[PDB]
Design a protein around this ligand. Sequence first.
Ligand SMILES: CCCCCCCCCCCCCCCCCC(=O)OC[C@H](COP(=O)(O)OCCN)OC(=O)CCCCCCCCCCCCCCCCC
Ligand SMILES: CCCCCCCCCCCC(=O)OC[C@H](COP(=O)(O)OCC[N+](C)(C)C)OC(=O)CCCCCCCCCCC
Lengths: 64, 81, 90, 83, 485, 55, 174, 124
Amino acid sequence: ALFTSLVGASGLGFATKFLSNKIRLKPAGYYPLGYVFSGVAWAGLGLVLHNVHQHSLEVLEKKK
Amino acid sequence: YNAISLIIILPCISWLFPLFFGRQLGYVFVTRMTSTLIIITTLITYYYFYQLLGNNNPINLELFNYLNIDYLDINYNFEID
Amino acid sequence: EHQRPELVSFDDINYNDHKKVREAQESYTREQFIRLEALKTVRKALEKCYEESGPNHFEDCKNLAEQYLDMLPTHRLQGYLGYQRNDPSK
Amino acid sequence: GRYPFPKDVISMTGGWWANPSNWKLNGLFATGIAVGLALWVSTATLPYTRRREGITSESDISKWNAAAGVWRERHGKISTGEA
Amino acid sequence: FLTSILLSSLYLFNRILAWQGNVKHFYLFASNLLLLFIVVLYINFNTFSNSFQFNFELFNSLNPFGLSNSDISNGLLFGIDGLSLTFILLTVLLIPLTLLGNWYNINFNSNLYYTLVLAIGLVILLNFWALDYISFYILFEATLPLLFILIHIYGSSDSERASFYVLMFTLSGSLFMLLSIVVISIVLNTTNFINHNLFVLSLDLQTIIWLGLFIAIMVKTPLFPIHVWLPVVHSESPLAGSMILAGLILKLALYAILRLLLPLLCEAQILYTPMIYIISLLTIILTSLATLRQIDLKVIIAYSSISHMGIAILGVCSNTSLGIYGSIVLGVAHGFVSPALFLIVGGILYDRYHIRIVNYYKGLTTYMPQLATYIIILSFANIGTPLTGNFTGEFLSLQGGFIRNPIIGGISCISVLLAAIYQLKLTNKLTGGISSIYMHRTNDVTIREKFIMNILIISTLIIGICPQIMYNLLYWTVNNYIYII
Amino acid sequence: HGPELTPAVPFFQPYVLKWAGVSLGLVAFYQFNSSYEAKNGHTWVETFFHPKSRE
Amino acid sequence: LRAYNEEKELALKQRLSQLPPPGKAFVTAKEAELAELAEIAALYKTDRVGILDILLLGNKHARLYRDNTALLKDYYYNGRRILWEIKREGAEKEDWVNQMYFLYAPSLILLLIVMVYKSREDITFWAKKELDQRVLDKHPEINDAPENERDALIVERIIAGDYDKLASLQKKAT
Amino acid sequence: IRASFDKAEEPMLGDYPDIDPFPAQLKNPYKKYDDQQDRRNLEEPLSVNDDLYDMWSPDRFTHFKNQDALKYFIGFLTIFFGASYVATYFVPEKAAIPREFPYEGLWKESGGTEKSKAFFGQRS
Ligand SMILES: CCCCCCCCCCCCCCCCCC(=O)OC[C@H](COP(=O)(O)OCCN)OC(=O)CCCCCCCCCCCCCCCCC
Ligand SMILES: CCCCCCCCCCCC(=O)OC[C@H](COP(=O)(O)OCC[N+](C)(C)C)OC(=O)CCCCCCCCCCC
């Protein structure tokens, strides 16, 4: 599914925003808009990776 | 009234109750109670010996399964030979 | 309900299908259990013989005792693996 | 010997010279529970009792010996004694 | 729906951390919810089917985040039979008890400790679900860093060397396990707990493959050549680390020898059971003998766990239905009764006096009568004194080991004697005598300690009075691994 | 006279109530299922046993 | 579903501002200063918060409350160790007994009951019923015998015959 | 020091005082110790293999030397079994024959069939 891939990659973006907050000795929700910034960026990487795997499967089935 | 069962159950009562209720009943009660119950047990087994002198027909009681594995069953079975 | 699933062997089937292999597995297993309760039936019959017989149990159920002690090395759980990994007559 | 003991500590089997004031009163409860448990175990294990002899007919064991001879004829199984 | 459950739950967790400093209430709550969930799964479990009932795939290519409905499967499989679910029930009723076991002694950095303990419990929970060799192996060594951090930060004087040994010996055996797993995955091109009895390898390829898996099992159910990290990783761990270790890791390797070796190494296994019997008799006798001269108190229970696992291995390697069943009963009953002993030595005895040497402890009955009651009841439950589940496991495993080889069964039957010598030698020293002049009098055993003890004693007594209560899970898997042609 | 006394203790301690109540409830429930089996041909708890069929 | 007062809590915090540390507030081996601390213990004990404010409130209210309950818990338990404080009775609930007696223990008894009644469903009862069904399959004349004769007639048929079909399965062997 | 295994662990100790091992039972009971039960003063150095010289160790008899006692024990055993075995030669024999049995020695009663009569048979 595409939606589960997007939500999971956004969770990876939330994880990297959280961990970078906590390296800075900040609270968790220090700057809450960086969460949506990081989630949109990592979800875009998930979008790219999903589309490349999709085109790859189509190339593999065109060898029938 | 079951003679084969009272022989088993009355000393178990005579053990489990002095431990669980020793602080609550005390030594002067538990002494007379433990002895009283073993007296009743040994009167029952004299009477059962007197009856088995009548016919040599023993009694067993059966309980639940200990283990049933492939060729091997073990049951809690109790008979007075 | 006492349902009775069908009996499958290891030899007619393709092993690349898993339905039939799993059923042949369970079939051979449950047949060993049927064999086993046959052995247990003869054991309970023998101890009924011994308890009813008293002193002459040597000659009333010589044959029941011989039957129990002949069935005992051969009527147990043996496992499907030993027959499904190896073919005799090959 | 009646040496002093600490009353700090609580054991379930009583402690040193455990003799509560209401041991009559608790003794009536222990009496009731003991006779009720003995009576109830006595009647509960009644149908699980059977005699040793006289359970099954001798017809049964004669024909089971016969069927054991049947199961021994078909496998060609020989005696213990003949070698 | 299922994502909204989780970010509700993550918000639940964040709010209760914001208002309550501790985590332990929520970790207990999640543990008991996990209990109820596994028992609801046991209600819906079909015992009449040999197959794997509750299957799910993670990290498939068509759906990397979530479940998989596909024509092609290259992720990690998960699913259970009765053999898996036995150890899952044993695991899930021990996880709340180890979170409860350190409810008051960890003071400084509590939330880290309880997170590590619950994380180790969850990893070992998922170990029994796994269905690939690589899916088993990934979770099989996810425990090790968490164990390293737990043993190193919390412990006694010597927790550096114990944390190093729990990484070192486990990693060193388990790398050879990875060697054999790689050889299996390049011959078969499949790693799977479903198909893998159908594939037959050559005899000398099997005898090469079997060695690397057996070396890792020798490290982790610690048989005599390397049985040696175990007393130091016990004797210097914190309480929940010791409890989780000796209740679950050793039984996990006991599960791995059934799940990984007996299906596709049958023709190898028959060639090697005399060597396993050498090693298992030789780790019963020599470890049971080396316990008699021990100055420390948790080390005695560590060596006890060695001797009981040595009894269980000649049950699984017996080629008998009785031996397989008795090894499972021994593993489950040992996982009950041994963490209670580690609680006696590490919780009721190390929280009060902070020393573990045997020479300080004498005459514990006269100030602590019910602790002494616990000590003698657990000593006899650990020996092989019947109506306990330990005797059911030891008796059926000794019987299977007598069938497979009667002479090593004859010399393995003396474990009944040898297991009782050191245990009663410790128990009469702890209970008997005038009260110690070194120990000042402390509190008797508290409500939570008595609670943990009562649960771990009832669950041995129920298996000991009726071992049939878990035959409904095992009657397939007791026939599954037998190779008698 | 006789033995010296110690203070009075109530009989029904909390553990007596807890352990007796749980075990008497389990025995009563077992007898209830053996009651229900004779009337309906099946246990009351196997009403709740819903596994999938083997096929 | 429950709510709290915040300036009760800020008055609480500045009440605790002039109080001594808990490492000396009771080390005085009296109620000139030990009668204001048992008030504070009793205020630790009662529930200020309920669950509807936990979710919908922000965070420095939570931090305020958190250090409040930390210092209050400290004043409760150190006074309980050295010495409401000055009483002696047994009705008390520690923090774990809510979800170990009411969630862990009934789930464990549930596990027992599911194991006991799941043990009805096993291969030995089913296999004895299947073997009986097979000899009633082959020889239906046992059908019209009376009830306890039927038992022993089945048993003599079991002794008289295999009734497996195991050699039926090993066709490649034969 | 005194025992052979105590001598065997001599080169492994370093920075350890190397006590003479003395059994804790063979000490005087009437000298007042800190623990009267273990018979030990409060900071007294412990030997290596001290749990072989503790109060909880074996009883360690005082009256015979151990090689003497092994000689006396194996003495009494071979005394009894030697007199037992020589006394079998000086026995008198019986005043009856061993009694015999009807139905050709009850062989049908003792299980048996006619091919199996020597295996399950009596005197006749
Ligand atoms: C950190 C170490 C690194 C290791 C990395 C390895 C992978 C780590 C991934 C971490 C999370 C793994 C657990 C994911 C749980 C997913 C639950 C699940 O898959 O249930 C769905 C499954 C399919 O259900 P279905 O009927 O198809 O419909 C879906 C809607 N329920 O439903 C079923 O068929 C029944 C299955 C029931 C699920 C039981 C799962 C038991 C374990 C749950 C707790 C595990 C927590 C693990 C966290 C620590 C990770 C080690
Ligand atoms: C000396 C040590 C004994 C210890 C006793 C401990 C209490 C157990 C009492 C059960 C007696 C009983 O309920 O038995 C009676 C029944 C019936 O017996 P049946 O013959 O199998 O069925 C009848 C067969 N007909 C039809 C041929 C006659 O049993 C059972 O099948 C139920 C098994 C339940 C066992 C679950 C035990 C769980 C642990 C309980 C303790 C914590």
